[PDB]
Amino acid sequence: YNPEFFLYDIFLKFCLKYIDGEICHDLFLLLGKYNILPYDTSNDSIYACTNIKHLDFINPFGVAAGFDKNGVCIDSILKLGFSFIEIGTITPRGQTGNAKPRIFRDVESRSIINSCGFNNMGCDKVTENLILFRKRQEEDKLLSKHIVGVSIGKNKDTVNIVDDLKYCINKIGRYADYIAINVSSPEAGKLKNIILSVKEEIDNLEKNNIMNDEFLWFNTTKKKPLVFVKLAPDLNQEQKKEIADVLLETNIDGMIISNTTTQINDIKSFENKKGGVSGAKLKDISTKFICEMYNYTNKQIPIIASGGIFSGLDALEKIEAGASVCQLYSCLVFNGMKSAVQIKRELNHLLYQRGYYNLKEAIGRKH
Ligand SMILES: Cc1cc2nc3c(=O)[nH]c(=O)nc-3n(C[C@H](O)[C@H](O)[C@H](O)COP(=O)(O)O)c2cc1C
Ligand SMILES: Cc1cc(Nc2ccc(S(F)(F)(F)(F)F)cc2)n2nc(C(C)(F)F)nc2n1
Ligand SMILES: O=C(O)c1cc(=O)[nH]c(=O)[nH]1
């Protein structure tokens, strides 16, 4: 609640009004890189703890993929009050992505559309960035117990998809607390192949190193990274159940629901635009998708929420629907740096008013 946050949020609101989106994004990533952004040093409520398997989160809010694609601003973003961040999506080789401008935002609807095109510095350089962070994390009190996942994907013109992801794992898998596979860009038999192949590569990292785990997994968990998969919402009920089966057969560690959507036409400033939409308008679509997969998987696979989360209320819908954890993106654009502090406040208070003992008790409370 400091003036630090408050003053910065004025600057951001101003930037939001006048300056191009991707230009704004990079500007504040830069400010974070030089560590002049504010901190949230509050103790988080132990009643809003959560986990995905043996992967524990000190609080249920993190940042989604695509926000810090190259892992350049990991400390500063985590210290805003987030329990974790998902970097990437990265590819084995650097990409430029599509032509600019490629990101636009509608303020009134609190929505965004993008056709970035998986721009990133490539797996090699980003791994060097994550390593440097991991080294800083050993020295910084505030980064303890904070989780860093890595989103991985295939190059535009890939020879083979699996091989792209395989390279990324070999390079960066040691520094990741979990690995996110996203097949959501704006047959199931080919998916199962991918998922398995990823678990095997991770399992191979363990086998082919002589070191014990403490000195092998240079991450937070000190164990091999979990395997999540991120799904787009533009599928039919048949696709979803077909996939739902796969995730069970592979015994995947969690699923990130969801990515952006192409099926929104009622945003006026966006009618000229191609890409995937995110923000408020994605909220209701996203939540429904969680109920479905939660049902289709019969509640065996943990879920990670993404799509139009702005408030402690929005967060609770995802949780009761079946999510264990939430990711923010659009909220930070429209609500600023206070988003983590603010949303954690709002959620803690609601859990009380809704008579919940803790957050885990509320997970999947939509029958
Ligand atoms: C500019 C931009 C870039 C994104 N890049 C990625 C990405 O690289 N990988 C990914 O899985 N999701 C990416 N996303 C999607 C977000 O991770 C998130 O799923 C989506 O924005 C919905 O969250 P929200 O409604 O809170 O904004 C991107 C979104 C935006 C707006
Ligand atoms: C004012 C503004 C800010 C912003 N992103 C953003 C906002 C805040 C921060 S941060 F991380 F201030 F501490 F929270 F630096 C980092 C990135 N974006 N991102 C975009 C976009 C949609 F182009 F990606 N437009 C923006 N406009
Ligand atoms: O980089 C992108 O263009 C992108 C990737 C993704 O997974 N989702 C999205 O909305 N954009």
CATH number for the domain that contains residue 180: 3.20.20.70
Q: Identity (one letter) of the amino acid at 75?
A: D
192 alpha-carbon distance from chain centroid: 22
21 lines ligand 1 (CB under 6 A): no
Domain of 77, in residue numbers: 1-367
SS3 at position 201? helix
The H-or-E segment that residue 26 falls in is helix 21-33
Cβ atoms 294, 275 nearer than 8 A: no
Burial of 266 (0-12, 13-18, 19+ CB in 10 A): exposed
Cβ atoms 54, 217 nearer than 8 A: no
Number of H helices, E strands in the chain: 13, 13
Beta bridge partners of 111: 106, 279
Nearest to 183 by CA among 148, 158, 147, 219: 158
Nearest to 328 by CA among 317, 319, 312, 339: 339
Q: Identity (one letter) of the amino acid at 268?
A: K
Distance separating alpha carbons of residues 67 and 303, to the nearest angstrom: 20
What the block records as the tokens of 139 is 């020295």
Catalytic residue among 45, 144, 185, 197: 185
What angle separates helix 237-249 from helix 283-296, to the nearest 10 degrees? 50
Cβ atoms 136, 149 nearer than 8 A: no
Burial of 271 (0-12, 13-18, 19+ CB in 10 A): exposed
The answer to whether the bond into 101 is cis (omega within 30° of 0) is yes
Beta bridge partners of 311: none
Distance separating alpha carbons of residues 317 and 363, to the nearest angstrom: 10
Cβ atoms 351, 286 nearer than 8 A: no
Cβ atoms 305, 290 nearer than 8 A: yes
Ligand 2 midpoint to CA 73 (Å): 12
Whole-number Cα distances in Å, 161 to 1, 154, 182, 188, 266: 46, 6, 12, 14, 35
Nearest to 149 by CA among 132, 172, 166, 167: 172
Q: Identity (one letter) of the amino acid at 168?
A: C
Largest CA distance in the chain: 58
Cα atoms in the 13 Å half-sphere on the side-chain side of 45: 19
What the block records as the tokens of 67 is 């926000």
Question: What's the Rg (C-alpha) of the chain?
Answer: 19
Nearest to 233 by CA among 211, 257, 209: 257
Distance separating alpha carbons of residues 24 and 325, to the nearest angstrom: 27
Please name the residue that has the structure tokens 């997994």: 217
Please name the residue that has the structure tokens 């139009």: 308
User: Closest residue (by CA) to atom 8 of ligand 3?
Assistant: 185
Distance separating alpha carbons of residues 169 and 293, to the nearest angstrom: 27
Please name the residue that has the structure tokens 């879920």: 303
Distance separating alpha carbons of residues 146 and 123, to the nearest angstrom: 22
For residue 90, give the ligand nearest its CA.
Answer: 1
Cβ atoms 318, 287 nearer than 8 A: yes
Distance separating alpha carbons of residues 88 and 19, to the nearest angstrom: 24
The answer to whether the bond into 197 is cis (omega within 30° of 0) is no
Residue 358 has phi, psi (to 5 degrees) of -140, 180
Cα atoms in the 13 Å half-sphere on the side-chain side of 355: 1
Beta bridge partners of 276: 114
Ligand 3 midpoint to CA 137 (Å): 28
DSSP 119: -
For residue 21, give the ligand nearest its CA.
Answer: 2
Resolution in A: 2.2
What the block records as the tokens of 352 is 């009380």
Q: Identity (one letter) of the amino acid at 126?
A: V
Nearest to 333 by CA among 3, 4, 27, 2: 27
What the block records as the tokens of 73 is 């601003």
User: Closest residue (by CA) to atom 21 of ligand 1?
Assistant: 278
Distance separating alpha carbons of residues 334 and 278, to the nearest angstrom: 12
User: Closest residue (by CA) to atom 22 of ligand 2?
Assistant: 21
Pairing label, strands 55-57, 50-52? antiparallel
Question: How many domains does the chain divide into?
Answer: 1
Pocket of ligand 3 (CB under 6 A): 66, 89, 114-118, 182, 184-186, 259-260, 276
Provide the sign of the torsion angle of the four alpha carbons 269, 274, 278, 283, taken in this order.
positive
The H-or-E segment that residue 76 falls in is helix 74-78
Ligand 1 midpoint to CA 195 (Å): 21
Cβ atoms 75, 130 nearer than 8 A: no
Distance separating alpha carbons of residues 239 and 26, to the nearest angstrom: 36
Cβ atoms 178, 147 nearer than 8 A: yes
Q: In what order do the strands lie in the sheet with 103-106?
A: 103-106, 111-114, 276-279
Q: Where are the beta strands (DSSP E) in the chain?
A: 50-52, 55-57, 61-63, 84-90, 103-106, 111-114, 147-152, 178-182, 226-231, 254-257, 276-279, 303-306, 325-328
309 lines ligand 1 (CB under 6 A): yes
Distance separating alpha carbons of residues 41 and 34, to the nearest angstrom: 19
Q: Identity (one letter) of the amino acid at 153?
A: G
Q: Which of 333, 334, 341 to mutate to test the pocket of ligand 2 (most atoms within 8 A of CB)?
A: 333
Distance separating alpha carbons of residues 94 and 77, to the nearest angstrom: 23
Q: Where are the alpha helices (DSSP H) in 250-321?
A: 283-296, 312-321
Cβ atoms 72, 27 nearer than 8 A: no
Tell me whether residue 185 is one of the annotated catalytic residues: yes
Distance separating alpha carbons of residues 159 and 161, to the nearest angstrom: 7
Cβ atoms 172, 90 nearer than 8 A: yes
Q: Identity (one letter) of the amino acid at 201?
A: E
**Residues whose CB is less than 8 angstroms from the CB of residue 365 and which lie 6 or more positions away in sequence, other chains included:** 319, 320
Residue 208 has phi, psi (to 5 degrees) of -90, 0
Distance separating alpha carbons of residues 296 and 326, to the nearest angstrom: 20
Distance separating alpha carbons of residues 275 and 273, to the nearest angstrom: 7
Please name the residue that has the structure tokens 């998987």: 297
Distance separating alpha carbons of residues 196 and 247, to the nearest angstrom: 10
